[PDB]
Symmetry: C3
Subunit: 288 residues, 3 copies
């Protein structure tokens, strides 16, 4: 691997005190050290073995950043903080050890070839320990994104915590916010175009300006594109200021309006607010 | 657009072999090429048209990175790997083509002005193909964040996969971990301050040290701030080592303790563990 | 704090017109300015107080980027766009003000020591305003990740929107895609290895090639590792082209096959498609 050297700056404090040759040589080397540091942090390090990362196929600065591909033997020694790794466990699980860190230090892993599995896992040992983990962190989720951050260092205590996420998938939410129920006692909230999702899950919480009346409900909806309708299933309903055990406080209905799956929320109570959030969706794609 | 040139390094191998003029000119140009490469990867490229990105309003290095605003005509030719784009489909949908990639290569898109929609979409063609997609990837989610990564190259096979997420929203989880049920047979787990959310959804899974007894349940809770209480709706309950079809294995209750919405988990069985995770929340904000 | 100066480039347009001393001094200073800009955007700025960030413990380029630790007095003045902050509200809540932005400008916050709470919050004022927020954005979620992006500038209107996420947690999805139901009328979809999760939540949507028949359902499953079985709870079922109010359109079953929790989907209708997505999971870890 390439272990950069800290930042070097040109000592302009000299020059009319050390002739050219000496200054240009010392300067250039410092400049090269710095650029190699930067380029290797945002570019493929495997290219250093060729013209020191120069040439027509030399290193480039990736705006998206870069995750290094290192070999098993290279992971025999602790990885530096701030580094990024694209793990390959295709032929065998790999273990990575992270040097002791300091508050905020971070190391991120990616799994572009999806080799991570239970038999060929990504084992991570963060010098000292990982919170909520006994010993090493064993990652078995293919095509995953693992982020480790140091949440406590001071002195003799270097503790890290982590996050694990899928590199891919449709995670977007088509709608999230709060809307007022107009004096007319009803409000339409466009969720998404009829063609974007087949199914969606939302949470709806309606509360009066004084918080005396409030209702919350979870709703799964199915988009029936052929009949231009939307089927819904509301459950886990909870209310507080309901005058009667029959009084809804707020009713939620669905339909397609202007080609947009739409939530229509109405209520008797005046000055009712309604928070609407889509927390999941499903779109039938193409098999395989 | 600005298409950087690979990394260039100063040939200190010369100097006391090529006079100053030649070395300073060749050096400076290389230095400028490199810095332009870096600055354009982390800064606004539209500024290059002014003093080559210099001046009081010249380019700067964004620690957060930067997403370039390019024109339609500029997207007529394949985009390089490692680039970032802030898409604008306000007047018309835009198509972007990504050059053939290699394992790990990445390209990320953002939609700051929220112009993406079904009529003015973001169409992406990743040289060769995108997994789970027939032809081009058509993005219609406004204010979205799209990430494309190459998951297979080798030779004649350049396949990419993608992720789509919302740029905005409250996605945080107020609590996730595992707690022991003390010998007293009960444990309180603070979830969040009474004022942070009106509604929350959690998953609870309790298992004995030997895995003979286990229960899982999903729970939606409503924070009644006025009466300082928390209403709950537990469902999808599943158990395995239940001695009786009336034996709960573990009971979950909610209330406000010390002003924190709190989960109280108790069980007869000794040595019971309980995993608690909040997978969704809803907070009534301000309309509009 | 360190407020970088815009990009500076070496004026090769001179040299055989201004002797060495003048060019090397002016050049070096520009080079240093640029590198300080880069290093301070991707490295610890607190090190500038020592040898200007040089030395054996000097600044380094973090591939993961870096989030600066600034003091209360330093936040008395507006923060520049593109900066990253690791907030510390351990002794008192801190307020940060963001200078007016332009479309796409971004500022990101992290909370490595988890000091953020309701009593010691992170208050953010984005010059002009934040959408869906009345006044300042008040963050009370510990160990959070806050991202602010400018979604509208033009002229007199500088509006921002934000996202809040947990820095840590297991958020990965073990499976998401679409599968064809073979002519045999049944398909097995491996979800994850039996040891990865104790509980999972999935959404399943099956639709015929012509969209006349379709069913959607939400399912929570519990992995019974001791008996090598999987218990399930299917609900919120919705159908459209059901010939009978008893006709399922598609049946979903679960079990462990080859040691992988597996979904088995079967249907009478020919040419049925099935979208399967795991939107939540729970793994019993170690208490504390």
């Amino acid at each position: 691997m390439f272990i950069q050297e800290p930042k070097k700056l040109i000592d302009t404090g000299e020059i009319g005190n050390a002739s050219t040759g000496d200054i240009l040589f010392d300067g250039g080397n410092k400049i090269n050290s710095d650029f190699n540091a930067i380029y290797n942090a945002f570019g493929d390090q495997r290219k250093m073995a060729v013209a020191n990362g120069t040439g027509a196929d030399g290193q480039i600065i990736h705006a998206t950043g870069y995750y290094q591909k290192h070999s098993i033997t290279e992971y025999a020694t602790p990885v530096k903080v701030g580094t990024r790794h694209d793990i390959d466990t295709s032929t065998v699980g790999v273990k990575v050890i992270i040097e002791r860190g300091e508050l905020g230090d971070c190391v991120e892993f990616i799994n572009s070839n999806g080799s991570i599995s239970v038999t060929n896992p990504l084992t991570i040992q963060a010098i000292d320990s990982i919170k909520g983990v006994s010993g090493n962190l064993v990652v078995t989720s293919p095509y995953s994104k693992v982020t480790l951050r140091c949440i406590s260092s001071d002195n003799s205590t270097s503790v890290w915590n982590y996050s694990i996420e899928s590199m891919f998938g449709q995670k977007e939410s088509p709608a999230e916010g709060t809307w007022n129920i107009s004096t007319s006692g009803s409000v339409d909230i466009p969720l998404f175009h009829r063609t974007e999702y087949n199914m969606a899950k939302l949470l709806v919480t309606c509360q009066s300006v004084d918080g005396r009346k409030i209702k919350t409900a979870e709703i799964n909806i199915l988009v029936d594109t052929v009949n231009s309708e939307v089927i819904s299933s509301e459950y886990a309903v909870m209310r507080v200021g309901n005058e009667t055990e029959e009084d809804e406080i707020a009713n939620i209905a669905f339909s397609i309006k202007e080609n947009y799956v739409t939530a229509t929320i109405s209520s008797s109570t005046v000055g009712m607010r309604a928070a609407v959030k889509v927390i999941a969706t499903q779109k039938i794609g193409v098999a395989q």
